[PDB]
Design a binder for these strands. Structure first.
Ligand code: MG
Ligand code: MG
Ligand code: MG
Ligand code: MG
Ligand code: MG
Ligand code: MG
Ligand code: MG
Ligand code: MG
Ligand code: MG
Ligand code: MG
Ligand code: MG
Ligand code: MG
Ligand code: MG
Ligand code: MG
Ligand code: MG
Ligand code: MG
Ligand code: MG
Ligand code: MG
Ligand code: MG
Ligand code: MG
Ligand code: MG
Lengths: 79, 64, 50, 76, 71
RNA sequence: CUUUAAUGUUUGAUGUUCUAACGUUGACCCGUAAUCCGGGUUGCGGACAGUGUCUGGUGGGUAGUUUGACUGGGGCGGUCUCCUCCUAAAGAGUAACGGAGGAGCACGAAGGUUGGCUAAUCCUGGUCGGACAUCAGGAGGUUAGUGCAAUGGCAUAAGCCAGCUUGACUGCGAGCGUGACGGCGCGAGCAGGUGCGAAAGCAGGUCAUAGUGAUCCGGUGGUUCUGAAUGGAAGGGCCAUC
RNA sequence: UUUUGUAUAAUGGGUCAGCGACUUAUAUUCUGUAGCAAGGUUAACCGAAUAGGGGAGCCGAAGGGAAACCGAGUCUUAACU
């Protein structure tokens, strides 16, 4: 990601990018729940059940990389 | 009309001195690393068509 | 599957190489063995390559 | 129904029987373990297959302290 | 490229064998540029091959009758 | 050579103005006894709009098609390739939506030699220590172990422990096993080099049987085999490999 | 006719007479027969023309190899017992 400016201006853009990515992650999660309910529903007679819809849902099961080390408070054992 | 030869077959079988056909062995084109060197080298020389499949080949190459 | 294909290039300068599978995770060290080189007809050292 | 699968038959057993004239290199028995051990004039492959090492006659014997079956080839 | 039987050297001309005198007797095709003499037939006459590629076995048979193989 | 500071200067962009291309489904005049069309004056816009070629987006408005098989009827459910055991009737093979389990790998050592060694469990004694950790000696006799399912094997160990090691070699291969074929498997021995051992000898991967995918198309190394007038080259071919 | 299987309550036919379904170029393989025979045969075309010319060409007498190439041998291979 190339940024033109200074550190102070770029830090806000970085935070914005993380927030938007988290929001998109949550939206994708909710979509996956909603489509899973339809996948697990019944059949209702001698009707379709939509092999194309099944293929779309199967494709939607992708993967994304969590930020590798958002490392947090270390450990120090007192003695 | 002269019989049109199956052009695909003329690229895979060659006639020999007596009347049999000579072809190339399969399984020697790609992912070979799992194959033993003994198996790789035994497929290298050209082979001759078997008995059952001879009938299906003379049909494809009437002129060859 | 975690073993990926590697090729052992020769060291006599000719173009000849074996191929094998090596665990690049737990064996980051490169391989080098003594194998036969049928171009120069000698047992030369084969080093690791791409 | 959960099960219902099987593997192709491997076609093992004794290929040449006693008193049979073989040529060098012909397979005598296709084996999984070593039910028949390698006697004189026969070999033993990596698949534990016993192949003839000289043309002759096949002879099954029960030599050994543990009564283990041996196959050896008479020279004829 | 065309093969030449040894026996075919008796139907050519008054003795010389060449690309033009070979195709003037309908032994080789009109558009055949190179040719090679093969030990397949029998000869008796002293033929002199003008320019060709007679083999090793056939060379010892042409000279036997009394031939001459130059370039 | 370094920073820049200017005026010229070419180009690029963003603008404002104009008239001459172009628009006028504004007004008047003529062809003409004609709310069509054309021509002429005059305004209003004006290099926009509009059309042609190329191009990105959208596009069931329209058109062409696809939407597997088995199945104790079809649908829904399950399944589709490979390995082990039983059914399978003491050679081989042998079905069902018959009965039970696994595989889509791992290992530069868990491979090759040369040396050496031999388990589970139980008992008695003993510091923390017990039902069970380490030590000692007795019964024991493979109930042990195998890199991962099951069957067949294993003490000469194929199980366990170290040294040096790369044969987890190149070209071949008498002769066989099994397949309708494609193919798959076993292989003594020969040649060139190689490791281990004092040698005789052993070694062309792992105790064996699963760990997989034809052809086409294309990628990367080697090879003047070929090279469309000739010399080169592109492109093919052959070997290795993805 | 179709079938594992039909008196079958499975199909078809009211009856007579006429019509109604494996053919025709070309090419290729095998068999029989006829002609020549390491040779066999012509096509288009010319021709007072089913004759006679026309041998362009096709098949065969040599194979191996991807190919150059070699040649009763050749390919593989550094080289094959
Ligand atoms: Mg290739
Ligand atoms: Mg001619
Ligand atoms: Mg439609
Ligand atoms: Mg259509
Ligand atoms: Mg069906
Ligand atoms: Mg039986
Ligand atoms: Mg049986
Ligand atoms: Mg092991
Ligand atoms: Mg030992
Ligand atoms: Mg071992
Ligand atoms: Mg194993
Ligand atoms: Mg050229
Ligand atoms: Mg190339
Ligand atoms: Mg019938
Ligand atoms: Mg019925
Ligand atoms: Mg009856
Ligand atoms: Mg009836
Ligand atoms: Mg009745
Ligand atoms: Mg009916
Ligand atoms: Mg009726
Ligand atoms: Mg030839």
């Amino acid at each position: 990601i190339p940024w033109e400016g200074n550190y102070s201006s770029w830090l806000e853009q970085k935070d914005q990018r993380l927030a938007q990515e988290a929001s998109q992650e949550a939206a994708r999660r909710k979509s996956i729940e909603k489509e899973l309910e339809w996948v697990r529903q019944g059949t209702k007679g001698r009707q379709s059940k939509g092999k194309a819809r099944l293929a779309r849902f199967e494709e939607l099961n992708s993967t994304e990389y969590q930020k590798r080390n958002e490392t947090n408070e270390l450990f120090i054992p007192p003695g | 009309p002269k019989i049109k030869t199956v052009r695909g077959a003329a690229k895979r079988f060659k006639k020999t001195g007596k009347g049999g056909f000579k072809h190339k062995h399969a399984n020697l084109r790609h992912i070979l690393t799992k194959k033993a060197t003994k198996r790789k080298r035994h497929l290298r020389p050209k082979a001759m068509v078997s008995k059952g499949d001879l009938g299906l080949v003379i049909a494809c190459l009437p002129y060859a | 599957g975690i073993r990926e294909k590697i090729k052992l290039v020769s060291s006599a300068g000719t173009g000849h190489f074996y191929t094998t599978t090596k665990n690049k995770r737990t064996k980051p060290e490169k391989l080098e063995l003594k194998k036969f080189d049928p171009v120069v007809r000698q047992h030369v050292i084969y080093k690791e390559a791409k | 129904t959960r099960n219902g699968r099987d593997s192709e038959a491997k076609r093992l057993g004794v290929k040449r029987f006693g008193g049979e004239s073989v040529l060098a290199g012909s397979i005598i028995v296709r084996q999984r373990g070593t039910k028949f051990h390698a006697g004189a004039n026969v070999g033993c492959g990596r698949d534990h297959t016993l192949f003839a090492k000289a043309d002759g006659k096949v002879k099954f014997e029960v030599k050994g302290p543990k009564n283990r079956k041996f196959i050896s080839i008479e020279a004829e | 490229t065309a093969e030449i039987r040894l026996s075919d050297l008796a139907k050519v001309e008054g003795g010389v064998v060449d690309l033009n005198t070979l195709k003037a007797a309908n032994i080789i095709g009109i558009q055949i540029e190179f040719a090679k003499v093969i030990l397949a037939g029998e000869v008796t006459t002293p033929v002199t091959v003008r320019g060709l590629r007679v083999t090793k076995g056939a060379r010892a048979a042409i000279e036997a009758a009394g031939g001459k193989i130059e370039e």
